[PDB]
Amino acid sequence: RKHHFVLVHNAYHGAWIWYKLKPLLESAGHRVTAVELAASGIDPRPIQAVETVDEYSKPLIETLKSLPENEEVILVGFSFGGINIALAADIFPAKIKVLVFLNAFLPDTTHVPSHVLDKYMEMPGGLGDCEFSSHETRNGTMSLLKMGPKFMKARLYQNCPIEDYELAKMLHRQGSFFTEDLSKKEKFSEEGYGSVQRVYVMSSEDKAIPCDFIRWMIDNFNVSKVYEIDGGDHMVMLSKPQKLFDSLSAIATDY
Amino acid sequence: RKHHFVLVHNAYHGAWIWYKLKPLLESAGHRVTAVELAASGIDPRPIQAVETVDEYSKPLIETLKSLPENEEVILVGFSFGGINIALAADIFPAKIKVLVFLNAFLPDTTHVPSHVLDKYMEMPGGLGDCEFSSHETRNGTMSLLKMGPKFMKARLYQNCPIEDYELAKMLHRQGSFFTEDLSKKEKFSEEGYGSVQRVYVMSSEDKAIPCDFIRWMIDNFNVSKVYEIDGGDHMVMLSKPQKLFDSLSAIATDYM
């Protein structure tokens, strides 16, 4: 059978990252919706205009809200999109058969929502030539970030065709992890987010989110299955689009 | 010898269209600058905030303005980018070694700047599922347009990998031809735009700008050479990126 995949991109990026995967899915007869979150991609809003993670995810929530009733989706969250889908699952858990965490941050149901993001930022190394900034909001300061080209090439796009790195340099935008908003947020519920089925999909060569951090997350909060994509970098939908399709196709079958 | 290519995209698109060509050029040892015009791509401005063609091209003019002194570029204008480069050539003619009109509107030095755009809009065919709109400005109404998916697929991306049509659907924005602003504008000068070296590069299968309209334009206003890319659609930098590279590489050699 065929399913409806809702694809949710990562921060500093947009729906455009799914341009290789979307036709592969649709060509197999699945329906695909590539959500464009706020201040992301060609969204007209600056990131300064998006002060809470809730506003950031609004387009995703809006997509599920207006979903034909009784329809269920495969919700795919890439990277920071993992927080987004957890957010959405806690509102519309019954519109989601399975949550797919693709090289994503996998939040738990026990600590503040920002937990795995904080534990991540505490890792040694820093972030290459990324540019940290701050922004005062109605509710304290919001931490902003824009990636640097060297950081992107070395830790996100190492296995991508050069065209895709170049394309990213032309499209990536300043964004946020909303670590501050998320720290003040009510923890994800077990009745909502917790009740939804969830699997993990990880690239074997993810240099943005270390394999061991990924394992600490899954350890911290179990999933039904863990699929691995051999040779994928962080941007596995650009480096290994076909293998990503194979993974999601296996997921669709299992669920 | 290696040159500095300045790439200027078309309306409703952005710098992102050059993602296949940029590395081909740079890999051959040319330097590449893919300008992002106003209200284009990930530019934070709505098109409603850009009321004149001058504002639209400002990033291009700004790029040439801050160019190292005595440096000359190969300025590539794609589609409506042809008007943009003609605009720029009329300001900084000496910073430009050759103008490359890629499936572009080639304005002359005789009629109002909007001329070839008007003559274009008068042609039968219409524009599929494109969405026409208007917008009141400080200087009368501005005509806006947003492409429709069917129109794009059939007349711009017919020869492109499906991924690139899908990518475009995710990135194209509402834009304008500034036909109204351009009609009120002083015609391009012969001392500026006219003095600069210009060639034409055309796709053999361009369904957005008909081969015969392209020939009427070149007829209307001659170029040094006309290169043809066999099998290219309108978006030739996405369908035939390597042949596009071959053409520009030939151009660089001829104007070396």
Numbering used by the authors:
A (entry chain B): 3 to 257
B (entry chain A): 3 to 258
How do the authors describe this structure?
The crystal structure of AtHNL shows a striking structural similarity between AtHNL and HbHNL, both in the polypeptide fold and with respect to the presence and location of crucial active site residues, for example, the Ser-His-Asp catalytic triad. The asymmetric unit consists of four protein molecules forming two independent dimers. The PISA-analysis on the interaction surfaces indicates that the dimeric arrangement is also likely to be present in solution. Specifically, the lysine residue crucial for stabilizing the negative charge on the cyanide (Lys236 in HbHNL) is replaced by methionine. The cyano group is oriented toward the main-chain NH-groups of Phe82 and Ala13 and is located at the N-terminal end of the α-helix following the “nucleophile elbow” in the α/β-hydrolase fold. In contrast to HbHNL (and MeHNL), however, the latter is not accomplished by a positively charged (lysine) residue but presumably by a combination of main-chain amide hydrogen bonds and a helix dipole more similar to the stabilization of the oxyanion in α/β-hydrolases.
In 2007 a hydroxynitrile lyase from the noncyanogenic plant Arabidopsis thaliana (mouse-ear cress) was discovered (AtHNL) which exhibits high sequence similarity to the S-selective HbHNL (45 % identity and 67 % similarity) but quite unexpectedly was found to be R-selective for a wide range of converted cyanohydrins.
